[PDB]
């Protein structure tokens, strides 16, 4: 009945985890000093919830799986494991070591069949087995009814889902980080509760953001480069850092998982789909998607995000490789701190005064990390000024001033308070959805040797 | 079950050690007044962790070993001991004395075989034995599956790892000091928790750094030297001082162990490798490396360091041999002190006022060592000034001012706050990897005599 | 198991002794009012430690021995006792009186053999006995494996060690005062914890140092001496005063025991040696040296000293024989007092204000002796001023100003704070190492008479 998580017993993150999973009993049990403990704990509880919701005797496809995590489960899993990332050969070896070390000791699980399944694929790397295959999400031929994506960011969502549906899959799950900051087109940001920072490739030489490195210099003037950049806008390449682990991502694929509430898949076969968010905790979400045959209803093309805590996006000034520039940064703010600044923001406040007030509220144990305070104080100061300016320029009801050209005002801060919602327009009608092993002889030999005894 | 460390029972370092090794029970037991006790305690616990992680019945290679430390272990070690440093003949003699004094009293360990192995090498200094050899890491011929580097700074990392891999090694470990300050190209620095200071060879005659010596003088003017230095930049030679022990190092070899998360080794045989940091405590780290046959995935070439406490690098002014100069210095700062200065650094503060505030926070028992306070106060003062200057020179969004030449600003301080990450670009594709005994007759005779009874 | 020392039970020096020897149990037992009690207690515990570290059944050479101290030991000692100092005939008589008064009452020790050994030497003053001889460290012919130097300052270290190594000695120990202040070339200094003061011969007529004497005078003007001194620099001759005992020393021989960590001895036979400091307590140290045959590794030539408390060296003004001059003085400062002055020294302070603050911290029982306070207060005041001047003359990074001749600044104070290290360059490659009884008939007759009954 209880669930054990590898976190410290005095951690403040334990209370937030309990609030997000009211149907479990969470107990701390620390064994390792892993620096991504909070992120791993959330994903561990997410899989437990999914298994409870679905019924036994169901076949589940695990896309981009790590087979060692499913070894001690009593459900039927079919692991789809292509070898496309540099961390994959190590995961395969860890799978074989755990299997051989448990043979003859665990009897409830189908240990013998799993070992037999692995050997068959090694001899002929083209056969489908009940528990293992070497194909991709498009070229796999096994039929099931449930599909699971756990921390997968490298596929195009409408294309991948369509190939799952024509094989009889009616339910899908997606676990990962929130995609909202990438719909606002920010240049850098943070997930402070999970010790996570990300940044665009062009600003990796900044000075005062979470993920950067710079140098000491005296300051020259020439730097004669005739070719002009003249413009600095976000590009596709993005670097992620969870704890001390680095992951490169792509903006196009990240935004493709920001699906609307209702959409249609039109091809040789047609489907009507629905997307819903069931769990949310300070940047991690769980999504649930259903698919049914036929075309019903109509679509609007809107996606909605509910904010339990504050969300900020502001303009900041920094030096990149010694040159002063400006770009945008986003972050999350705890709800208690947001509610205690309502009275202060009724008037204009300087950034220096806001910083001192935030320190007093925080260090009263820290509610929020201290390295994000300076940019939050700057954002709050500009938001109050812009609100004050609006009240002093009252317009008339039901008219638009166009004396024909209109002026556009300047906006430096976007602040979504708790209990508010964001809404964006995306595509909702899809009608376009258009193999080698990759294993080497030395790797196949090594896997066989570990399995023998 | 408990682990004993040779430190004082009232030491404040005991709490930090407990937090870094949650899977053990640490108990103090002081027997000697060793002045490098904290450094020795970390290395003692690191080896215990490694043995627990790996499975028995495995062959382990100990590169650059001190065989006396492995004499009471129940695992199979193969010590690779060339004689290339002046401290090696003493280590060999200590090994023989401990073996002869334990013969006939310890039976669990393979004492008799170890004595027999040592005698065979003395007669013919070219044979490989199960527990001992006189070759280097390149010319050894024994095959194993685990390799361990404990405080080894004298080898080129990609070259050494490649020769280990072609012999069947799949796992490697490296224990030593953090290499991050040498990637920032500092001239001097400190590791205050371990009583360690280091400096470049050119600044050994300074006045107010950790490792220096100078004289008294009245001040002359001529010093007529026509040849001009005209420039002062870091060189290859670096001196280390742990407690009262001196060690010379080389900058090129130190930086070669700052490996990226993913890299390839291309030669007659090809391998794909991964590097990860598992333990970190105030500048002391443990790294884990895996190697697999074949080429998979792609590489980016980025190395990431996670900061649990503050990291600083600043410009300082001193007199070297009576002449005033300027260079850079780095150090580490405890996290609690960093969090308590957030409010103060919101405005501009003089170096004198910052020093008095730091003393009040520290001496409230000392959290940090007092001899690094003056340079920390100066570094904090310049960081606050530069942040204020950036806020008063706001630019426009998405543009670069190039009215074509751009001006570069001056930077005097780099400050990495807790819960932030550094990132550097390094090489990740390697394709180039290109014997005598050294023992003397008098030394061989002495070893034989100690072994006889 | 316990060790007894002849010091007062309420002395504050007892705590420092316990910290330096954690492996013993120290108990006070006062029997005499000796004024060099602290220095004698340290040497007593040092010999006990050495006996524990080495194994029984080993032959030990005692260079420059006092044979009465080794009379009640159960180990095998070979006392090398030439008669070259005026205190030697008295030490020999004390040896004979104790032997005759213990015959027939002590049975565990080899009392009968020691008495027989003494008589043989008197008849023929050229024979080597297992426990006694009349030669020097160069002309002795006994072979052993351990050598001990206890408060010996009258030999050249590289020459003495070479003659010990060719006789089969592999380990050596040296006990004495710290040689660091003589590497800085000071004119006078103190060891306040041991009631020890030393001074150069040229300043024995000063007024306000530890070891001096002067007269009252009204002040004349002529003193017509055509020959000009014109210069005052340290010379070879130095006087020591431990308690109320006077010892003359030589600067050349004192500096020869400041050995580097690694050095080579090259001659007919070659050796590789290593030096290490194992005990340190407020200026009193124990050194351990090992020697092995052959040539291995390379040398740098650096010697390192670790400071557990503060070390000072400053400029002072005094009248010598009525004439005002200036010279340098060194001393030691307790660590607790050093840590409490960090805040004060952030700004400029006058010598008068510094003296009052030091008195308040000290007399709050005395942590430090009051007669050294005036020179410590003056040294602190000048150090703060010089640091302030450096901050106001900032230079540029990586360049040297030589507009070609450069100016040298004035330095009046050297301050080594606790947890710092000194480093000096010394010689590390040695290749040059190039008898009468002295007893009288009346002395031999007296020794024989005391032995008979
Ligand atoms: N087109 C595709 N179809 C199926 N799997 C793919 C794929 N492209 C990449 N992958 C796999 O998806 C994996 C993402 S890494 C995720 C591993 C695992 N889910 C975990 O939580 O640790 C990679 O190992 C890669 O091999
Ligand atoms: N190329 C090489 N291959 C293998 N060992 C080497 C080597 N170059 C130097 N060494 C050895 O590496 C040692 C480093 S000193 C480290 C000793 C031991 N690991 C300890 O913890 O104390 C030296 O003794 C030197 O003999
Ligand atoms: N060249 C030499 N070789 C051996 N002994 C010498 C020597 N020159 C001087 N000595 C002896 O060294 C002694 C130093 S006095 C030290 C005595 C004794 N170790 C103690 O602690 O009391 C002198 O008595 C002198 O006789
Ligand atoms: Mg990891
Ligand atoms: Mg040592
Ligand atoms: Mg006396
Ligand atoms: Zn499949
Ligand atoms: Zn070998
Ligand atoms: Zn002799």
Residue numbers in the entry:
A (entry chain L), B (entry chain A), C (entry chain B): 2 to 365, 376 to 414, 421 to 451, 456 to 474
Publication excerpt:
Chikungunya virus (CHIKV) nonstructural protein 1 (nsP1) contains both the N7-guanine methyltransferase and guanylyltransferase activities and catalyzes the 5′ end cap formation of viral RNAs. Twelve copies of nsP1s organize into a dodecameric ring structure with the bifunctional MTase/GTase catalytic domain forming the upper ring, while the lower ring is responsible for oligomerization and membrane association. nsP1 catalyzes the 7-methylguanosine (m7G) cap (Cap-0) formation differently from the eukaryotic mRNA capping machinery: the methyl group is added to the N7 of GTP by MTase, following which the m7Gp moiety is transferred to the 5′ diphosphate end of viral RNA by GTase.
To reveal the decapping mechanism of nsP1, we determined the capping/decapping inactive mutation H37A nsP1-mut in complex with SAH and mRNA analog, Cap-1 RNA m7GpppAmU at a resolution of 2.4 Å by cryo-EM. All twelve copies of the GTase active sites in the nsP1 ring are occupied by m7GpppAmU RNA and SAH. Further, the triphosphates of m7G0 cap form H-bonds with the positively charged side chains of arginine residues, R41 and R70. The α- and β-phosphates interact with a magnesium ion, while the γ-phosphate indirectly interacts with a magnesium ion in a water-mediated manner. The A1 base is stabilized by the T33-P34-N35 loop and V279 of the neighboring nsP1. The U2 base is sandwiched between the A1 base and the side chain of R289 from the neighboring nsP1(H37A).
